[PDB]
């Protein structure tokens with residue numbers, strides 16, 4: 001339907017509209033935001049997982065009959081969709097390179113989109129230097145991590161987007177979470193992270209499978225590891241606080257809705273307790289490694305690398321992942337697997353990890369047999385998309 | 399300047415190699431920074447303690463401090479900013495190269511050793527101007543795909559993946575890194591890929607090149623150790639330190 005533009009102009013008039021956009025965390029932030037606001041305001045209109053273009057958005061308003069809508073919107077669609085919709089609130093999760101790919105082009109798309117509703121507030125991730133790069137017409141509030149600071153340090157040399165947008169010197173960090181996010185500061189000019197309106201002030205307990213943290217004087221717990229879930233939680237809590245929802249209602253809503261983060265993917269092979277983790281890019285893989293580094297037990301590590309259509313043919317990205325972390329982990333033994341068993345074993349040897357404890361397997365079946373016969377009770381498996389499907393499929397045959 | 403990477407302090411080594419990872423925090427794309435990890439791996443196998451320093455914008459470069467310079471590729475914006483800093487390192491890099499010290503330069507790093515490169519949109523970015531090659535642009539077209547080259551000076555075959563708009567032309571005082579068996583190489587007019595000039599090795603190869611070609615990794619490190627400690631030293635053989643990588647290496651039988 002070309003006339004989807006006419007349905008939106010019509011049906012969207014009678015809603016207070018929140019738009020969630022950015023590179024990553026759009027779906028999870030939207031879902032948790034909907035869960036929390038429901039506790040305060042009852043039924044909330046929202047789009048299915050990933051249905052974040054003109055069609056998915058139009059269909060969402062078509063299923064509904066002074067109400068709130070929280071919509072995930074594809075960055076590229078936003079400038080168009082906001083000539084039809086007039087959102088009251090924009091949430092910016094983050095801005096990172098499309099990996100296939102210019103960050104300031106995808107950024108200009110969401111700046112243009114919000115510019116079309118110049119009175120709407122933007123709630124942005126203050127930890128992203130991109131979100132302080134431009135004079136913005138809309139009113140802006142910022143959320144981020146306001147935990148203990150250290151002296152300015154460079155981010156890891158493989159980090160993207162670390163040039164000062166004002167003076168073209170290299171930014172440093174008094175706190176770095178992942179990628180280019182944190183308490184950024186230019187040592188050459190005045191540019192630095194703005195004062196945060198919404199503050200994660202303490203990390204209480206961060207484990208391989210959970211996190212507890214304080215946002216604006218209240219405690220939250222999620223039953224999944226990894227920093228990116230803490231940002232998605234921070235963003236959703238910030239929206240609820242902007243909407244004036246009470247601390248007691250945010251907690252009740254948070255606890256009922258946090259299952260939308262899912263759980264780590266756990267199963268057993270014989271008497272071994274196993275966790276399977278999808279890897280597809282340098283920042284993601286590096287964050288998986290930092291998470292499993294927190295495990296309070298010895299484990300085997302299996303890395304399964306395929307290069308099929310659905311994985312991406314390119315495996316050069318493993319060289320940018322922080323596999324050097326494996327020398328600072330309680331790892332008993334390493335299995336190198338997938339079709340590219342040879343390249344991933346070479347990538348792990350080059351860390352300086354004992355090469356007598358790195359073993360290639362030509363068949364995923366042999367990885368499973370090796371894990372069943374291993375001494376350590378725990379096994380972690382990091383796999384590309386197709387390696388993960390074949391691995392789950394072989395487990396299903398037992 | 400800071401140290402990004404260091405061999406373990408508690409292991410013994412008879413040699414010491416220091417690597418300048420030139421703009422390593424700005425020219426950091428396409429896994430090309432993997433070349434640093436391959437040099438460290440091969441150097442340690444040969445009995446060298448490795449120190450890698452990130453020598454980036456506004457950092458002084460002293461040629462006497464380094465045994466290998468690695469200059470990789472980056473995005474167009476980061477490469478334009480690096481180009482503004484280059485004049486500050488020109489004298490020391492010219493002297494480094496003139497002394498037959500080892501450089502590996504990939505994509506943008508290879509282009510920026512030369513006179514200039516031109517972006518797709520026609521904007522000319524001046525390079526160090528220390529070597530005579532230059533890079534023209536292509537308005538719309540890119541060279542993309544698998545490539546294989548053969549260096550006749552060393553009788554070595556290199557494999558990789560190219561993805562560049564740049565069309566590089568070598569000056570009369572340079573050699574190619576190799577002659578194209580299949581793929582585009584520098585410009586699709588001659589059969590040249592990369593550059594070999596003194597102990598400068600340049601390429602458009604992603605891989606990273608030293609992961610896919612341990613013959614070249616071995617060559618760069620042994621060359622650096624023999625420049626530092628003299629040509630009479632005896633290093634472990636290719637076959638003894640890299641037997642497994644040699645056995646598993648991708649190679650094919652295509653001719654041209």
Ligand SMILES: Nc1ncnc2c1ncn2[C@@H]1O[C@H](COP(=O)(O)OP(=O)(O)NP(=O)(O)O)[C@@H](O)[C@H]1O
Pocket residue numbers: 022023024025026027028029050093094228229231232284
């Ligand atoms: N805050 C975050 N920062 C970085 N990566 C994240 C973040 N949240 C999620 N991710 C990653 O992105 C994946 C998709 O999460 P999701 O919330 O669906 O993101 P999205 O913006 O909707 N993008 P996508 O579904 O992949 O088009 C997750 O499985 C993580 O791998």
Ligand SMILES: [Mg+2]
Pocket residue numbers: 026027028049050
């Ligand atoms: Mg999504």
Ligand SMILES: [Zn+2]
Pocket residue numbers: 164165166167168169186187188189190191
């Ligand atoms: Zn600055």
